[PDB]
RNA sequence: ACACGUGCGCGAGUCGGGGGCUACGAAAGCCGCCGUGGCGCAAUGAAGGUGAAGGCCGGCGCCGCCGGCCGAGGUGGGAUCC
RNA sequence: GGCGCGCCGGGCCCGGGUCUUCCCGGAGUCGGGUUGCUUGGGAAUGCAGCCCAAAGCGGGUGGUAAACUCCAUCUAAGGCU
RNA sequence: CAGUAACGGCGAGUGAACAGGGAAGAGCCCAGCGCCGAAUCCCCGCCCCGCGGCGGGGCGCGGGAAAUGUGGCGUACGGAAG
């Protein structure tokens, strides 16, 4: 009942043991730093929200998140970028209702 | 084989020649056409020199460009099979014995 | 206009091709120039290998060539680490470094580590001021016997391992090579749709 | 040799072997592959059937290295390994089979064309044809897969 | 550092704060000439990134470029050709308005050398760019080993040869499967290699 | 570039043409762990792919598979040879 | 003119590995829609105009449009050689 | 590779890339982030060398640029501090 290594199928290719070298330092670009989180949080207070974000808020407020996704998808560009944007404007909108009652 | 090999290898030591790309084409010549009792050859543009209205393009015209001007991308060199080049030296050597 | 049965054929000669005809009367003059510039380089590096620095043992990508081994850009930073050579010191003793090379396998790593161990042993290192040797160099009797290596240093020869005639077991006789391949194909092809209908169940 | 050519023999004639009636004019059928569906239809049908029309699927970034699978037939299988191995295997009593790594010699798939000489083999190939396997088994041998 | 706060502020251009600043400046700039010296970088931050330092011999010209596409300069729309080349209105220019800005700066300032450039505002009719210029003959630049690459005659008029960052964007160079058409030095070098018969001496 | 014919070399191979090594010579000679590579040695399907003789005699008048040995057709016409 | 022996002039007063604690990025730009040109690049290879316009376990690519995921692979919008 | 994948009144025609062998082979620097009393640079006057590639060393509450950021360390291969 000996199997052979096969150039095709489910677990294919030459027999190779995989070494765990530390992942490259370029891989962690765009990873959210504790300080740079503070700076975007800081300027969010100073600047506020863009007119397309403020309209996206007021479609999430009345509960119309598909029509808020279809809105942002037109404005910001793609579907992955819109789905992220809506879930950020759903986070900073649900955070206002926490600050509302107390 | 000795003739064949000698008469392909001797072409390889041979420098290119060509007529110049511009030879006979450095006129602004234009045919007069019919109605002028002259032979529809491109004639040179007018002016009190001997060339004015002569015959400037074409193999046959004095001055003029030669027929099919010689290019430097003529296939000058010939490659012989190494086995054949060897079987020419062998032959050339064995002939020297007698 | 086509005469009879002949090949249907499309010359790419409709552009003004005669303006851009590259001829090769340079060829023997080029070769003389490259050879003079190679001898002139080799004389400038008096003791050092004329070919340039050692390259790593490297598998060729894509299935066509992965049975072959070629010289690489340079040694990986993790091949240099295990060898224990500082990446900036490596380049000064004639070792190719490219920091772009990963190491997915331990075999490729250990081949190229052992490759550098061999180099560091053979390499005769001259002192910086020649008149006074210091602690981290080669002995003066070796320095006199140090002269150029022509062709690529430790040339990377492709070698297949010897195997002797084995008696064929009943496992090897019973193994269905063709049936095993055709099963494997259908399993990889029908993995996602089987798992789709295990979900439905 | 310009002297061996036909043009030398045609000095003194008139038309230069190109016809007195139907002159050697420039391009009297159009240029290149012109009129393949019109005035040259019969040539492109009598001699090039299939020339016009689409058939099959486009494959945009085709990389010829992926589909690379150089095939060896069983009839030339013993040329991959030295003639010394073929001799010494038949002599030696053990029943020990020499190993033919088809991948080392530079082939991947073993196809089953010819008669294979009756002595055991261990063919280390990447792929096998069905008939190729049956012959190797039939002679009394193993088909090892490799990657 | 302040520069990261200035960076992320400039990324919120639809914010009330930056909309006001981008409108009151884009007003200010219209009333000046199309090619005038700014006394400092309008964006000190962005100019830092693009290589502008705050030392003697670094010059900054605010130049405005008139905005829109490129209509074919042909008398009364008569392109005397085949219907393919009848196009006159909806045609576009191969280089960005920023690259056209860098080269109006670089031509006028024939002595100076265009390092780089950055956006500072757009009306419907005018885009406004600051262009970073360097004196190759000021001893601050001429004795700095970091910046004595612009002091060499290879880098005369980078803007005129698409060698500034904005000019390089027009050239379609870059590594990989999308940029095959500019393999070699350039689009012209690619074309040249491919449209040459190599007639080897033997062949 | 192609086709066919012909001459020559080698021949299931063949070819360095690119690269490299060593007055006429920018030639010639050499490389073989320089055959990378081309073309040939395998075809066919759009593709996934698959991929190029068998018979007989026995262990269970017919058995899936155990083994055994000979083993790459047949007819007709066929220069030559016997 | 280019190389080396020795005396002097003044710069230059520098390393490595392990161990914790910290730090880490280029925006009217990516990207999107549309238009024109461009490409072998085909539901759009590249380039540009105008409109929209980001993100940060993000972003780009992974040659068929799209959603859901899984992986692989680089870190664009700054520079030199 | 390759007249190939692809393009094209899918006609005429057009038409690259990867891998592979070689020629050559060499790597690097900022901004940002942060640390160091602007630790930085330019120009005038004097003196002493000194150069037909105005450079070196003194002297001066001599001037100026520069905190709207100069220099050193440091840049994705990670870096810094102790």
Curated annotation (Swiss-Prot), chain A:
Keywords: Acetylation, Cytoplasm, Ribonucleoprotein, Ribosomal protein. It comes from the Eukaryota. InterPro entries: Ribosomal_eL36, Ribosomal_eL36_sf. Residues 8-30 are annotated as: Disordered. GO terms for molecular function: structural constituent of ribosome. It is found in: Cytoplasm, Cytosol; Cytoplasm. The keyword Ribosomal protein applies. One of its GO terms (cellular component) is ribonucleoprotein complex. Residues 12-30 have a biased composition (Basic residues). GO terms for biological process: translation. The modification N6-acetyllysine is found at residue 61. Component of the large ribosomal subunit. The ribosome is a large ribonucleoprotein complex responsible for the synthesis of proteins in the cell. Belongs to the eukaryotic ribosomal protein eL36 family. Component of the large ribosomal subunit. This is Large ribosomal subunit protein eL36. The lineage of its organism: Eukaryota, Metazoa, Chordata, Craniata, Vertebrata.
UniProtKB/Swiss-Prot annotation, chain B:
Citrullinated by PADI4. It is found in: Cytoplasm. The modification N6-acetyllysine is found at residue 71. The modification Omega-N-methylarginine is found at residue 62. Transmembrane segments: none annotated. It comes from the Eukaryota. Component of the large ribosomal subunit. The ribosome is a large ribonucleoprotein complex responsible for the synthesis of proteins in the cell. Belongs to the universal ribosomal protein uL4 family. Component of the large ribosomal subunit. May bind IPO9 with low affinity. Interacts with RBM3. This is Large ribosomal subunit protein uL4. It comes from Oryctolagus cuniculus.
From Swiss-Prot, chain D:
The modification (3S)-3-hydroxyhistidine is found at residue 38. GO terms for biological process: translation. It is found in: Cytoplasm. GO terms for cellular component: cytosolic large ribosomal subunit. The modification Phosphoserine is found at residue 67. Coiled coil: none annotated. The keyword Phosphoprotein applies. Residues 1-29 have a biased composition (Basic residues). Belongs to the universal ribosomal protein uL15 family. Component of the large ribosomal subunit. The ribosome is a large ribonucleoprotein complex responsible for the synthesis of proteins in the cell. HAMAP family: Ribosomal_uL15 (MF_01341). This is Large ribosomal subunit protein uL15. The lineage of its organism: Eukaryota, Metazoa, Chordata, Craniata, Vertebrata. The gene is RPL27A.
Curated annotation (Swiss-Prot), chain E:
GO terms for molecular function: RNA binding; structural constituent of ribosome. The keyword Transmembrane does not apply. InterPro entries: Rbsml_eL15_core_dom_sf (IPR024794), Ribosomal_eL15 (IPR000439), Ribosomal_eL15_CS (IPR020925), Ribosomal_uL23/eL15/eS24_sf (IPR012678). Residues 164-185 are annotated as: Disordered. Residues 168-181 have a biased composition (Basic residues). Keywords: Cytoplasm, Isopeptide bond, Lipoprotein, Myristate, Phosphoprotein, Ribonucleoprotein, Ribosomal protein, Ubl conjugation. Component of the large ribosomal subunit. The ribosome is a large ribonucleoprotein complex responsible for the synthesis of proteins in the cell. This is Large ribosomal subunit protein eL15. It comes from Oryctolagus cuniculus.
